[PDB]
Amino acid sequence: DSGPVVATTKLVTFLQRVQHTALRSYPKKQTPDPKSYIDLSLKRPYSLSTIESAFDDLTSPVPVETLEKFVKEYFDGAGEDLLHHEPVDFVSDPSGFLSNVENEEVREWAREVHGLWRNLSCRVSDSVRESADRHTLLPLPEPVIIPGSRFREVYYWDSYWVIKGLMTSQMFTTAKGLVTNLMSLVETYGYALNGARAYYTNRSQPPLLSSMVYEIYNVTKDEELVRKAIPLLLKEYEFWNSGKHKVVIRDANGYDHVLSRYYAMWNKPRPESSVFDEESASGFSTMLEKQRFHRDIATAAESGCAFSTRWMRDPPNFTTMATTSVVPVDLNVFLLKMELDIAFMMKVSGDQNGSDRFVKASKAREKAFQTVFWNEKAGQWLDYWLSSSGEESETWKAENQNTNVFASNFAPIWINSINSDENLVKKVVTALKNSGLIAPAGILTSLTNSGQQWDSPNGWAPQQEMIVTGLGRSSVKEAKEMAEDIARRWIKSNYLVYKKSGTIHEKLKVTELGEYGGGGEYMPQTGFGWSNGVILAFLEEYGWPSHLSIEALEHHHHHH
Numbered sequence: 035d036s037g038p039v040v041a042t043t044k045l046v047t048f049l050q051r052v053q054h055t056a057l058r059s060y061p062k063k064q065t066p067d068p069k070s071y072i073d074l075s076l077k078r079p080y081s082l083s084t085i086e087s088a089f090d091d092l093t094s095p096v097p098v099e100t101l102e103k104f105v106k107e108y109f110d111g112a113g114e115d116l117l118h119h120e121p122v123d124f125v126s127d128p129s130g131f132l133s134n135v136e137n138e139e140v141r142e143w144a145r146e147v148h149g150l151w152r153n154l155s156c157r158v159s160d161s162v163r164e165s166a167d168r169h170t171l172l173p174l175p176e177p178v179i180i181p182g183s184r185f186r187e188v189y190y191w192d193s194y195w196v197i198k199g200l201m202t203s204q205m206f207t208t209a210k211g212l213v214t215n216l217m218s219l220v221e222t223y224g225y226a227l228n229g230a231r232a233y234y235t236n237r238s239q240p241p242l243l244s245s246m247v248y249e250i251y252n253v254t255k256d257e258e259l260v261r262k263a264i265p266l267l268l269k270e271y272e273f274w275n276s277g278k279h280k281v282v283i284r285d286a287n288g289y290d291h292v293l294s295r296y297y298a299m300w301n302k303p304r305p306e307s308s309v310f311d312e313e314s315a316s317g318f319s320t321m322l323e324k325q326r327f328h329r330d331i332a333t334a335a336e337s338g339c340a341f342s343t344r345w346m347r348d349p350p351n352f353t354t355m356a357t358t359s360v361v362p363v364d365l366n367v368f369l370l371k372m373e374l375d376i377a378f379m380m381k382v383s384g385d386q387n388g389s390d391r392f393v394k395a396s397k398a399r400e401k402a403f404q405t406v407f408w409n410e411k412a413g414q415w416l417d418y419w420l421s422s423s424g425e426e427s428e429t430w431k432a433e434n435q436n437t438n439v440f441a442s443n444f445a446p447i448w449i450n451s452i453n454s455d456e457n458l459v460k461k462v463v464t465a466l467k468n469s470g471l472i473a474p475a476g477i478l479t480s481l482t483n484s485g486q487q488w489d490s491p492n493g494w495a496p497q498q499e500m501i502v503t504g505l506g507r508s509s510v511k512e513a514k515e516m517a518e519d520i521a522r523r524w525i526k527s528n529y530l531v532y533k534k535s536g537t538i539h540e541k542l543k544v545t546e547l548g549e550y551g552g553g554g555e556y557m558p559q560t561g562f563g564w565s566n567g568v569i570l571a572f573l574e575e576y577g578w579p580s581h582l583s584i585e586a587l588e589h590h591h592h593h594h
């Protein structure tokens with residue numbers, strides 16, 4: 035690759051060696067999660083040089099008993115450097131919490147979901163700050179909310195929907211803390227990392243930071259937060275609008291549309307999945323093909339949706355991942371959101387000429403959505419696949435739109451200039467109604483059952499929320515009806531799942547009421563940050579009447 039690469043740490047490189055040994059030692063019916071080995075930290079007082087030398091003696095297939103003894107002796111385990119934290123603003127039953135939820139069974143369930151913020155609340159241990167080089171966990175200034183289970187660290191875009199839920203939970207200090215943490219990542223690296231781990235320094239994630247700041251500010255009117263956030267949001271904005279992230283698509287009327295793609299600064303196996311990734315690339319002839327494929331994999335991770343037919347050139351063929359060729363609808367929704375957020379914030383802070391720069395920017399991206407992304411026949415917005423490398427501008431071609439149907443195709447409904455357009459909303463409602471994405475438990479993320487997790491039969495919390503929120507803001511009766519119907523489907527199914535398992539799941543199998551989803555490279559995970567956040571946010575928006583059942587026995591097609 036001629037393209038840019040952010041180096042990793044010697045620790046991460048070493049821990050991949052441990053990972054490879056482990057995935058070879060265990061029987062195929064007991065293979066562990068590879069991520070757990072890159073989350074280890076070095077047990078004092080031994081240096082990395084000492085532990086690597088001892089690992090070399092050990093490996094010079096290691097039996098499972100010998101390997102576990104080695105790992106127990108030289109490492110503190112995964113997550114041991116991430117400490118439980120009692121959130122200062124947590125209250126077991128906040129006054130006025132979900133007062134519009136009059137179904138007492140539902141409100142008590144939501145209180146239990148609210149209670150899970152304590153489980154997800156952590157603080158990076160002091161050991162990390164005093165000797166950061168011994169941990170892959172990154173130091174952070176404030177306590178975090180994590181997604182849960184194997185996601186032993188704060189993630190970027192999950193934090194938005196977590197924050198939406200924290201605001202229902204009346205936890206505005208914890209919410210600001212998340213923003214403070216991500217702001218410190220932008221300060222250090224120039225972008226917000228995929229997550230607060232050493233092996234994520236090479237990529238970002240969908241740019242939700244401005245939206246987090248906006249949603250908090252809209253409640254607390256925290257002017258200091260906005261003032262602190264503006265220069266960091268400007269850094270983030272230039273990051274997405276320069277270098278390999280920026281592409282130019284020229285339309286038939288002569289307008290150059292400046293848009294973004296994902297682009298991880300990495301061209302190797304992801305350390306956290308190093309064994310899986312080396313295997314999946316084993317079939318490529320040249321090193322250059324492998325490096326291109328690895329960049330496309332790590333870019334699909336940067337998309338927040340690893341993995342999906344959405345990023346494959348010949349779906350469902352995983353080896354055809356091609357994420358750096360995709361100008362994605364949802365990424366550019368978030369960048370439109372950033373331009374609107376930053377214009378609002380500079381108006382608030384009293385920078386009128388700055389606010390005009392981003393009004394001009396948002397109108398220009400609004401033009402790009404009408405020309406580059408919209409597809410009138412489909413009634414939705416389509417990812418745009420590049421013909422070339424993205425170095426130089428290219429001319430828009432209708433055949434380069436991905437006509438496959440995804441929940442992300444409806445992401446622009448989240449933007450107020452779109453959901454304010456009655457005629458457009460009507461077309462989108464019809465397209466969503468007729469797409470096949472609306473399933474018993476919510477909105478399918480795609481229509482292809484690939485075995486990947488960001489595909490049918492799964493639906494995902496962030497994707498439900500953006501469509502429900504956007505549709506619910508239009509003045510169109512059919513849209514507000516559709517949003518509430520989807521929100522109650524999603525709530526109900528998550529409750530039915532919880533009634534069985536006592537846990538909230540990462541993703542739902544939305545083709546069936548009350549089933550969680552799976553697929554992909556790791557087992558279904560529970561917690562779960564954005565899933566808790568959307569459950570609570572939907573309940574605050576819609577409530578739940580006392581006489582409306584949440585149980586599976588009743589299946590009304592009429593609402594109350």
Ligand SMILES: OC[C@H]1O[C@H](O[C@H]2O[C@H](CO)[C@@H](O)[C@H](O)[C@H]2O)[C@H](O)[C@@H](O)[C@@H]1O
Nearest residue numbers: 181189191192228304306335338340540
């Ligand atoms: O398996 C390694 C990958 O894990 C992550 O993908 C997850 O991270 C999400 C969103 O930010 C989770 O909350 C979500 O449910 C997963 O899809 C990570 O983001 C990737 O970088 C890792 O390669």
